[PDB]
Each structure stands twice: as structure tokens, then as C-alpha cells.
């Protein structure tokens, strides 16, 4: 047996997320360790308005703290990985989750990036879920508007970019539905450069421990553990693709038996599901969750 634990990212937040880990001294200690480092309270914004919620400044933050407080919960209980993943913020808490850098460090690094992220704003990202993949590819062949931002499970992709960009290969690319993402920037595209390359800047200077279990980044999914070939996929990942796909296929294939999504809600899973259907799959984003082991 092996088993994979795989980190969600923006999207997969909902209110009262991570409110019932509140009794577990870990949850309590982490908590007030990220009211200090963010100057709020992830405990209270999660128990907020949804729409606030889902304002990527708020929600990465939010998902990264969660995401540490479950890991450890399982670690406590004895659980460990054998490999881990996280997808576009989820990393952050993969990366955590392996030893590449402590929990505030982390917590910093998601601040900054969904600041950056938050201010990059302009563009426009949309989902497109059962399409043809034929006409997705002559729509985004020399599309200097719009590219593929993730790839996540036959069935579904992201594409990013322009408003204009988007809303066109939306209306012209057979596949419902067509969903405009809640998010108000082109991310995971080259128009997050400048963005990037500031955040690059305080990436490179911090270190990165060796993983202490293999990582597949979202740019490159191929197992690693080198503290710096990681981060140099991590200093990629802004302006480039997610690779989920991919990722599921490389642990279904590597050798992991077992797929659990730690974090709230079934996104992961729900995409490991007609991905690699033979993977047994757990959600742990809930007390309940971690109780039943």
C-alpha cells in the first residue's frame, strides 16, 4: 500500500471550512500562530461571508492554515504520506507537508502570492468541462489571448486570459457548460509575468529543505524531493500550467494505492474519479473525516 495526499486550491473553500479542527490543540496553536503572522483571523474569516471568502487574498491563506492544520492531524494520528501534491496553492501546503519549509514560512510565502495574485487582476479564467478536445486545440493554437492554464481530468480544463479571449472560445468550442471562474486575473498564464517575477524575488531567497517525501509540482509532476529543483517548479508555477492530470496518472503509475484530498470539498477526488477510477479516494477536510481513520 501506498498512499498519495493530495492539497486543494482556490475553489474548494466553503464557509465553516477548518471551524470544527478548533478543538484539537494543534488547530488551536496553528491558528493563532496565523492570526499573528497575517494580522486576522483565519477561524473568524472562515466563518464569514462567502463571496468575501472566496476573494483569493482571504482564501489562500485560509486553505494553506487548514490544509498544515489537517496534515498534522493525520500525522498525529499516525498517518503518513507517500507522496504528495497540491494543486496551484495546494503546493504550498504540499511542499509544507514534505518539510520544505515550516509552517510560517509557508504561511508568509501564500500571503505574498495572494496578494500579488489578488492586485494582478484584469483578465479572466473559465472552465470547460466534457469539450471537444479537437476544436479546444484550433481555438487556443496561436491564441496569444488565451492559453491553457489547467489541465485537471479529460473531462476538464481551465483556459486563461483576456476577458475577450475567453468569452470567444467559450462560444466557440463545443463542450457545457462553459463556467467563468470566480477569480478576476489571467492565472497561470504569461500575463501573471510581472506579478511573478517580483514574488520570484522573495522566492529565491529563502531555502528549501530537501522533501522528506516525493513532491509533483504542478509545472513539472515527475517525483522529486531536491529542496531546489522544487523551488525552481514552484518559482515556474504562477505563469504556468497545472498539470493535474498528469499528476494523478504519474502517483496512479509511480506506485501509490490510495489518493486522499486534504482539504474541504470532493474536487480531487471528484477528478481522480475519471482519472485513475481505480484509486481508492478519502476526503479529510472535516474532524468527522479524521475520526473514522
Same mark, same amino acid.
Given at each position: 500500500?501506498?498512499?498519495?495526499?493530495?492539497f486543494?486550491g482556490?475553489?474548494?473553500?466553503?464557509?465553516?471550512?477548518?471551524?470544527?479542527?478548533?478543538?484539537?490543540? $494543534?488547530?488551536?496553536?496553528?491558528?493563532?500562530?496565523?492570526?499573528? $503572522?497575517?494580522?486576522?483571523?483565519?477561524?473568524?474569516?472562515?466563518?464569514?461571508d462567502?463571496?468575501?471568502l472566496?476573494?483569493?487574498?482571504?482564501?489562500?491563506p485560509?486553505?494553506?492554515?487548514?490544509?498544515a492544520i489537517?496534515?498534522?492531524?493525520?500525522?498525529?494520528?499516525?498517518?503518513?504520506?507517500?507522496?504528495?501534491?497540491?494543486?496551484s496553492?495546494?503546493?504550498?501546503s504540499?511542499?509544507?507537508?514534505?518539510?520544505?519549509?515550516?509552517?510560517?514560512?509557508?504561511?508568509?510565502? %501564500?500571503?505574498?502570492?495572494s496578494e500579488?495574485?489578488a492586485?494582478?487582476?484584469?483578465?479572466?479564467?473559465?472552465?470547460?468541462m466534457?469539450?471537444?478536445?479537437?476544436?479546444?486545440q484550433?481555438?487556443?493554437?496561436?491564441?496569444?489571448?488565451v492559453?491553457?492554464?489547467?489541465?485537471?481530468?479529460?473531462?476538464?480544463?481551465? $483556459?486563461?486570459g483576456? %476577458?475577450?479571449?475567453v468569452?470567444? $472560445?467559450?462560444?466557440?468550442?463545443?463542450a457545457?457548460?462553459?463556467?467563468?471562474?470566480?477569480?478576476?486575473?489571467?492565472?497561470?498564464?504569461?500575463?501573471?509575468?510581472?506579478?511573478?517575477?517580483?514574488?520570484?524575488?522573495?522566492?529565491?531567497?529563502?531555502?528549501?529543505?530537501?522533501?522528506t517525501?516525493?513532491?509533483?509540482?504542478?509545472?513539472?509532476?515527475?517525483?522529486?524531493?531536491?529542496?531546489?529543483?522544487?523551488?525552481?517548479?514552484?518559482?515556474?508555477?504562477m505563469?504556468?500550467?497545472?498539470?493535474?492530470?498528469?499528476?494523478?496518472?504519474?502517483?496512479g503509475?509511480?506506485?501509490?494505492?490510495?489518493?486522499?484530498?486534504?482539504?474541504?470539498?470532493? %474536487?480531487?477526488?471528484?477528478?481522480?474519479?475519471?482519472?485513475?477510477?481505480?484509486?481508492?479516494?478519502?476526503?479529510?477536510?472535516?474532524?468527522?473525516?479524521?475520526?473514522?481513520?
Amino acid at each position: 500500500m501506498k498512499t498519495a495526499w493530495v492539497f486543494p486550491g482556490q475553489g474548494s473553500q466553503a464557509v465553516g471550512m477548518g471551524v470544527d479542527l478548533l478543538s484539537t490543540a $494543534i488547530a488551536k496553536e496553528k491558528y493563532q500562530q496565523a492570526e499573528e $503572522i497575517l494580522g486576522w483571523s483565519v477561524v473568524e474569516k472562515c466563518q464569514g461571508d462567502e463571496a468575501s471568502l472566496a476573494l483569493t487574498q482571504n482564501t489562500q491563506p485560509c486553505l494553506y492554515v487548514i490544509e498544515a492544520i489537517l496534515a498534522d492531524l493525520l500525522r498525529d494520528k499516525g498517518f503518513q504520506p507517500d507522496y504528495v501534491a497540491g494543486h496551484s496553492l495546494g503546493e504550498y501546503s504540499a511542499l509544507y507537508a514534505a518539510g520544505v519549509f515550516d509552517f510560517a514560512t509557508g504561511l508568509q510565502l %501564500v500571503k505574498q502570492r495572494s496578494e500579488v495574485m489578488a492586485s494582478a487582476s484584469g483578465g479572466m479564467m473559465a472552465a470547460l468541462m466534457k469539450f471537444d478536445q479537437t476544436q479546444l486545440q484550433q481555438a487556443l493554437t496561436d491564441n496569444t489571448e488565451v492559453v491553457l492554464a489547467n489541465d485537471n481530468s479529460p473531462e476538464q480544463v481551465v $483556459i486563461s486570459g483576456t %476577458v475577450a479571449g475567453v468569452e470567444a $472560445i467559450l462560444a466557440n468550442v463545443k463542450a457545457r457548460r462553459a463556467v467563468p471562474l470566480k477569480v478576476s486575473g489571467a492565472f497561470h498564464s504569461s500575463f501573471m509575468a510581472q506579478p511573478s517575477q517580483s514574488f520570484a524575488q522573495t522566492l529565491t531567497a529563502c531555502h528549501f529543505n530537501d522533501a522528506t517525501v516525493p513532491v509533483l509540482s504542478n509545472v513539472d509532476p515527475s517525483p522529486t524531493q531536491n529542496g531546489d529543483r522544487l523551488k525552481e517548479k514552484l518559482i515556474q508555477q504562477m505563469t504556468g500550467s497545472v498539470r493535474w492530470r498528469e499528476t494523478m496518472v504519474n502517483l496512479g503509475e509511480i506506485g501509490a494505492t490510495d489518493y486522499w484530498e486534504v482539504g474541504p470539498g470532493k %474536487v480531487l477526488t471528484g477528478l481522480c474519479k475519471r482519472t485513475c477510477p481505480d484509486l481508492n479516494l478519502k476526503n479529510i477536510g472535516q474532524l468527522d473525516d479524521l475520526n473514522s481513520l
